[PDB]
Write an enzyme that holds these catalytic residues in place. Structure first.
Site, PDB file in Angstrom:
ATOM      1  N   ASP D 218     -11.358  22.459  78.558  1.00 53.60           N
ATOM      2  CA  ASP D 218     -10.722  22.123  80.001  1.00 53.60           C
ATOM      3  C   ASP D 218      -9.825  23.340  80.235  1.00 53.60           C
ATOM      4  O   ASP D 218      -8.762  23.438  80.072  1.00 53.60           O
ATOM      5  CB  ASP D 218      -9.519  20.849  79.577  1.00 53.60           C
ATOM      6  CG  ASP D 218      -9.037  20.183  80.840  1.00 53.60           C
ATOM      7  OD1 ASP D 218      -9.265  20.720  81.683  1.00 53.60           O
ATOM      8  OD2 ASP D 218      -7.951  19.372  80.728  1.00 53.60           O
ATOM      9  N   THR D 244     -10.029  22.580  86.984  1.00 55.23           N
ATOM     10  CA  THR D 244      -9.107  22.050  88.118  1.00 55.23           C
ATOM     11  C   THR D 244      -9.486  23.244  89.267  1.00 55.23           C
ATOM     12  O   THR D 244      -9.318  24.380  88.832  1.00 55.23           O
ATOM     13  CB  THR D 244      -7.643  21.892  87.859  1.00 55.23           C
ATOM     14  OG1 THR D 244      -7.068  21.299  89.112  1.00 55.23           O
ATOM     15  CG2 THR D 244      -7.104  23.101  87.584  1.00 55.23           C
ATOM     16  N   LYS D 247      -4.599  25.725  90.552  1.00 55.49           N
ATOM     17  CA  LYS D 247      -3.807  26.512  89.754  1.00 55.49           C
ATOM     18  C   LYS D 247      -4.194  28.047  89.557  1.00 55.49           C
ATOM     19  O   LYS D 247      -4.225  28.573  90.490  1.00 55.49           O
ATOM     20  CB  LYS D 247      -3.937  25.810  88.148  1.00 55.49           C
ATOM     21  CG  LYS D 247      -3.407  24.479  87.831  1.00 55.49           C
ATOM     22  CD  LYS D 247      -3.817  24.381  86.566  1.00 55.49           C
ATOM     23  CE  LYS D 247      -3.855  22.738  86.600  1.00 55.49           C
ATOM     24  NZ  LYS D 247      -2.765  22.307  86.224  1.00 55.49           N
ATOM     25  N   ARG D 253      -6.547  21.008  95.829  1.00 61.65           N
ATOM     26  CA  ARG D 253      -6.561  19.954  94.814  1.00 61.65           C
ATOM     27  C   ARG D 253      -7.938  19.427  94.785  1.00 61.65           C
ATOM     28  O   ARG D 253      -8.360  18.944  95.632  1.00 61.65           O
ATOM     29  CB  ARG D 253      -5.455  19.062  95.248  1.00 61.65           C
ATOM     30  CG  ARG D 253      -4.347  19.618  95.486  1.00 61.65           C
ATOM     31  CD  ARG D 253      -3.717  20.442  94.732  1.00 61.65           C
ATOM     32  NE  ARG D 253      -2.186  20.448  94.534  1.00 61.65           N
ATOM     33  CZ  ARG D 253      -1.641  19.764  93.534  1.00 61.65           C
ATOM     34  NH1 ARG D 253      -2.387  18.919  92.803  1.00 61.65           N
ATOM     35  NH2 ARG D 253      -0.191  19.715  93.393  1.00 61.65           N
TER      36      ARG D 253
END
Ligand SMILES: Cc1ncc(COP(=O)(O)O)c(C=O)c1O
Ligand SMILES: Cc1ncc(COP(=O)(O)O)c(C=O)c1O
Ligand SMILES: Cc1ncc(COP(=O)(O)O)c(C=O)c1O
Ligand SMILES: Cc1ncc(COP(=O)(O)O)c(C=O)c1O
EC number: 2.1.2.1
Lengths: 470, 470, 470, 470
Positions: D218, D244, D247, D253
């Site tokens: 992850d 993701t 970040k 997003r």
């Protein structure tokens, strides 16, 4: 008229020896095998003749689904006198306040008893923590490999074992307390099927309370001992106690579930308090949940075995169990055998055959050929589950016939003489090391004279004692 | 020296009458109760004296975990001769090619048999479809309400019932075939515990094949009939057949699982083909999955009951079952009773007491007070599960003693005279309609003379016949 | 010194056309495609330019895990002004008493909204009943075949569909009410993605109350209609209402969960009463349960789309939706097309192409080649899910540009001319009937002139209207 | 005629500032808040202006359920050019052989990405092992307490954490390797959300292979670093990599799932070999499994952020991240702060405030009042999860504006001055130690002058730098 109808009547009243000599022979063959054998399998025993009579009786006929006061069809008046007489005797055998302990006596065997408790208190996929199989835990305490979940307990529930400490041989309670905080058990199993020593129920209760999990004991293997007081009782520490009605209780194959009723929580400012709802949950899991018509003929045998367990004779029998156990464990220890954990506080010992240079796999099948039966078992620190280096011997079966410390020392010498053979048959195979080869070399002709020699001696000894039932 | 040790020896060989007169009394009390009672509970029967002997024998002692050729401890040589002799007799009783049918004879009772099959073929939360409870399906076929899942089958698996057609009384196969396409069963249960007529196994197999689901029969209630051929056999249509070894098989409490082995799929262009892997899955679910040490003493009784079932006497006994059943069903039908479905193709009938203006709840408890026992049961079209208007009577139990059509007509007259009482006790309560009140009015003094009058007559009749076992 | 660091600064502020012309081209290509196309896909729409601005804003940057008053890191003061302004606007749009309705506006899209509700109210393996997929139910309402569970809703939960009545085309509420008593739903889904008519929320609530199950509406497809009152509101009958913030709400891709708070149970003799605990359960399932950092930039667009939906312009836009829908449905019905159910009470219609001798599979891919887009769909009574004979057309997308009844009749004529082609391309293939062949014959040269002919005409028409956003 | 219809047209094209000034104000308020704040929240960043443009575009309108070459409705020709251009850029950014790595770019956010992987590879109730929450693991890696399962990952799956070593601060791989043999993971999570140092993917792969479990990384928190090579890549050791897209990747997003395709098993005597079937399983879990219509407007931003990440400017930006991180970690370490683990190999550090006599709970809410934002976090060896003594600061957000080592040292001095305040406000409360009291004392008037003093200084500093997007 063709009247084979009065003959059909005869068939129902025809004795076994006449109706079906084939199974009558199989039975009288086994009866003999038991009498000429030194039975050291830890979980064995010889059932009372009063238990065997009650077993096969007209009690077999009545269907009595439900419980006393909640039967479903009319006729359960004498089956009620029984089931409440039985569970009444149970609560006495372990000296439990009936207002603090209930009991359910319908479970068909031991495993069905345990599984009913999980169904009633854990619910599907609730986490359970039991002693690991190779470290001395029963199958129903959870067992699963990387590939498949094997025990039903592990299929319908999520289990994770806690292990024995291989350096000491004792349960590693410090690691259990630690891992429990990661796994979050819902029920911890305080029971074993191959553990030489006592459980720290006191400490297992603390671990369970800190994680919010039930603590259930599986005293199937020491039910007889606990009842005679020869081993500390799990009842002052556990929420539920499952037990097999045989093994050290010398009853017929069946099982019971002890569950605490009464008051559970305090609430020192709420006033009112919580109560143990274990009675309804457990009873509802046995029926209408998992079982059907209770085996009233088995409850009969359990009832008479429970009375037999509350006697004085039974009290001293169990003390002889623990005595004959150490008498044996000592003899082997003196002979240079590594007894796992050093000894035993109960009726069985796990001897690590690596101290003599062999494994329980080969030793088991040679002792059997000599009419002394037992089973292999993995030892704390075993390097592979395929070559288990341990044998699990227990007294209760033999001591039930009359063996004493003096006699059990003779049993330990016969055993050793068996390992002496195992080492020889193993030296021949030697380089070519395969169980199939070892299995054959023993059945071969070279040793078929040496095994027969030791076999004559062990059977001549075993024949000298009684055999309850026949 | 204090030698209660030779006394302990005596206790293990002391007979039941001496060791524990308390249960000896309970047994001889029940034995009497059975002999003076007209037993019409459909699932009852009286076990052979050859079965009751084998039941309580030294076979109780040997632990024999595993299967023949896969035991785990040394000693299973005669227990092996048995378990393979038993399952051999099973495959004969139903005339199955051993190369197309295997059998597992370890299940403890009936319910444990069924549950093992689901564990082995369905896996947790797999969908199961069985006959609805109030429509004549056993608990283990699935049972759950809006609020809680009640049967273990419904807890660990997702069940949905299919119902009987209230207008006809027969299973509504058209609706099953339809709903199955919405539910997607993985296993369909073709079995009943209160169904007057035959199952369309032929059509249930079609529904299961169209949905890709196993078809398992639960012939526990007609095992004896199927074996004598008095009712079409579910074996030519089902993948698995579970059965109780008692009820119409007159054995001891136990259970078996028949499973087809061999070839399953075709592949008319692949060449090679699929094979039924049911043997390994089912056997692995019984052990090491759900059970432990088999009850070898129960397998003994099953073995002798299986031989007893392959006799000629057994063949005619079952034919008398179906004959005495219609002889009874006819007598009541003539008397104005509504027999659900019109009659019966097997050993039991469901009579709808609404044709006489009462319900099985009140009628059950008055017949019981008259020493004729049976059970209430919901009828197709019942308006509430609390006031069930049906009684389920079956012949096998009584006909096992010697009753004939002539006699069963006398049994039907006694029954009616019981309903005549129920109607009277119900007219007194009348407006004030409560079971607790009805229950009391019967135990009251007004009718305690009338019930005793009919009770004397029914017991005087029942006493005239034998009672296998004592 | 090597200062590409002031250049890196430029890259973050460089416009799209300069940073990445490749996606800038892809976007301006699609923008064109949308403007020259007659969009009839029922679930489409063109988002406001005020929504598209709020979408891509600095709101994208703030992580704001939690809820207003339960954030976790410091900085959520303006993201709080938003999330409470948004859910405030929601409760207004549907005119719900805030003291009887709460709303959660974080769900990422529609499907994630629905799944969160099941997680919060049903729990794993709880039973759910939704409209069947081929009968007009969304994937997340449950979908599974004999072989595999396909929709996540069917994987983690046990679903069973209820079907439309093929003779009428309407939901078969009588069969639902009936099967629910066998399946025991825990939550019933009152929502569709391809249903011409209104739901009997009144009757679905009765079915759910009789089975003890939540009733949740999935108004994603009629959210815009319900808000303008052009279709009865599911809020006076449902416990929970999930909705997509696009489709007929003309917002950005997101989702919301409406949940009733307040008082649930009566207790007319207990005094105190039960309360809806839906607020905590639903909010705890969205977070910390299934999602993470909310998409504050999406909540912004939802907030402005909600204000846009409470306008007067929006009210008449929705009325034109239903009007243009019947204006279209009527035109086709007059032309001999079978409109499933006869017509529509909402913004879409399912036309059964079997009335013209073709199927939606072939018709879909030819209309697409003509720049009029829609989707195939199974019809009530379809004989195979592979050759679906239905097309699902909806107005909201086109009417959002300015189309009126007059115009939609021209859209219906263009559509028909498309089916005229489908029938020709289908007659050529004729005997040789395969989708791959039909797919090719259209791309072939014979018809590449005829398709281009109709394509020029449809694009010349579509170009005449606006396209919100650019 | 009443023509608000040309007005409705205007509303769809009306700009945000005019349509809804209320959210226009909320946005321009937040934009300001971001520019005057020192953003140290580890998971934050400022998105490119090229990403924010692509975000809100006509791409928002097209529903495109499915994948390229498996769409479902006609119109997905340019959405196809995008989704394959995007996943093409992904496989480049991390320099993966497309024939050994596939990628799925539809996941809505990060959490939805992770959950899809479990659904596709683990199946319900499969065991998962992730870093414990308080030791630096994300919620979706599993989180559950004695009482309730909190994270969806822990609800639908059975999770058990592995912990960091409190004496060192590093992951305790030895204990993981050990407990894994008791728990039997099916998938091990090699990812963190608050870990200063690198993962031993090499060793985690060994643990997973020894237990037969997938190893999934992850890398959401270090995606930007891995891509620039400033941190070893998890791709040479993991079966799946979830990430993701924001970040440290500075995108919008969204989320992606990298999965290895190709050949998995050897079979050095079987000839043929096994193949990774991860592509079908993962893609089938995203859709039709968990999601619906992909957010094509988000894939656009991800596509441009991926191109932006493959630049040279992006490469040096990430190097400055790690440099500014140690530049900060060093400054605090020199000032007497305990930096957990000693330092950092990536973009964030966990500083244990117990070295200064306070806790992150009180320090967080005072720094926030000074316009420097971060979050509390438990430290290895924390005595209670309620008084967390750690703060998690990260560079990527601030360094994205232009901060350099020199500047970050000024940021470390401002931070300390914040802790100086926390200690004062804590000494006043002192004996009376409650967060509610501390929270109030700060908002009180005594310190409202001192906080404003430090707040003026930090905002005057933060204002000096740019803010990408506006
Ligand atoms: C420790 C223990 N628990 C449970 C059981 C249950 O086994 P069985 O079903 O044969 O009674 C036994 C064996 C046992 O030894
Ligand atoms: C139809 C049927 N199935 C299964 C069973 C199993 O019940 P038991 O466990 O008492 O054998 C019985 C009772 C039965 O009548
Ligand atoms: C009826 C319905 N429910 C739910 C959804 C959710 O889909 P999505 O995730 O694309 O918003 C849609 C599509 C829909 O049409
Ligand atoms: C390590 C990590 N994994 C997963 C996620 C997913 O969170 P989100 O759904 O907000 O993208 C985040 C946050 C994260 O920091």
């Amino acid at each position: 008229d063709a009247d084979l109808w009065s003959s059909h009547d005869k068939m129902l009243a025809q004795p076994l020896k006449d109706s079906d000599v084939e199974v009558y022979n199989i039975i009288k063959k086994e009866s003999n095998r038991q009498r000429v054998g030194l039975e050291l399998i830890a979980s064995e025993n010889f059932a009372s003749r009063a238990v065997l009579e009650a077993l096969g009786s007209c009690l077999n006929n009545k269907y009595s689904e439900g419980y006393p006061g909640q039967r479903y069809y009319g006729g359960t008046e004498f089956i009620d006198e029984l089931e409440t007489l039985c569970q009444k005797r149970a609560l006495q055998a372990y000296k439990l306040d009936p207002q603090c302990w209930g009991v359910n006596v319908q479970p068909y065997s031991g495993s069905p008893a345990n599984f009913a408790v999980y169904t009633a208190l854990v619910e599907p996929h609730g986490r359970i923590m039991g002693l690991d199989l190779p470290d001395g835990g029963h199958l129903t305490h959870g067992f699963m490999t990387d590939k498949k979940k094997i025990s039903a307990t592990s299929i319908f529930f999520e289990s994770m074992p806690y292990k024995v400490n291989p350096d000491t041989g004792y349960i590693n309670y410090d690691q259990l307390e630690e891992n429990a905080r990661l796994f979050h058990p819902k029920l911890i199993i305080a029971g074993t099927s191959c553990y030489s020593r006592n459980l720290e129920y006191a400490r297992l209760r603390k671990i369970a309370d800190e994680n919010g999990a039930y603590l259930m004991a599986d005293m199937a293997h020491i039910s007889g001992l606990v009842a005679a007081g020869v081993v500390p009782s799990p009842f002052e520490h556990c929420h539920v106690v499952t037990t097999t009605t045989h093994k050290t209780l010398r009853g017929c194959r069946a099982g019971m579930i002890f569950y605490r009723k009464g008051v559970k929580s305090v609430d020192p400012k709420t006033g009112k308090e919580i109560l143990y709802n274990l009675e309804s949950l457990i009873n509802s899991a046995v029926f209408p949940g998992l079982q059907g018509g209770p085996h009233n003929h088995a409850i009969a045998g359990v009832a008479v075995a429970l009375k037999q367990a509350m006697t004085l004779e039974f009290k001293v029998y169990q003390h002889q169990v623990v005595a004959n156990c150490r008498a044996l464990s000592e003899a082997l220890t003196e002979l240079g055998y590594k007894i796992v954990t050093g000894g035993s506080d109960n009726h069985l010992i796990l001897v690590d055959l690596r101290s003599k240079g062999t494994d329980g796999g080969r030793a088991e099948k040679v002792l059997e050929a000599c009419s002394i039966a037992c089973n292999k078992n993995t030892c704390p620190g075993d390097r592979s589950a395929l070559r288990p280096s341990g044998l699990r011997l227990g007294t209760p079966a033999l001591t039930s016939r009359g063996l004493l410390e003096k006699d059990f020392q003779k049993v330990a010498h016969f055993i050793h003489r068996g390992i002496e053979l195992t080492l020889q048959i193993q030296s021949d195979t030697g380089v070519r090391a395969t169980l199939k080869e070892f299995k054959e070399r023993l059945a071969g002709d070279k040793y078929q004279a040496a095994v027969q020699a030791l076999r004559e001696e062990v059977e001549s000894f075993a024949s000298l004692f009684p055999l309850p039932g026949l």
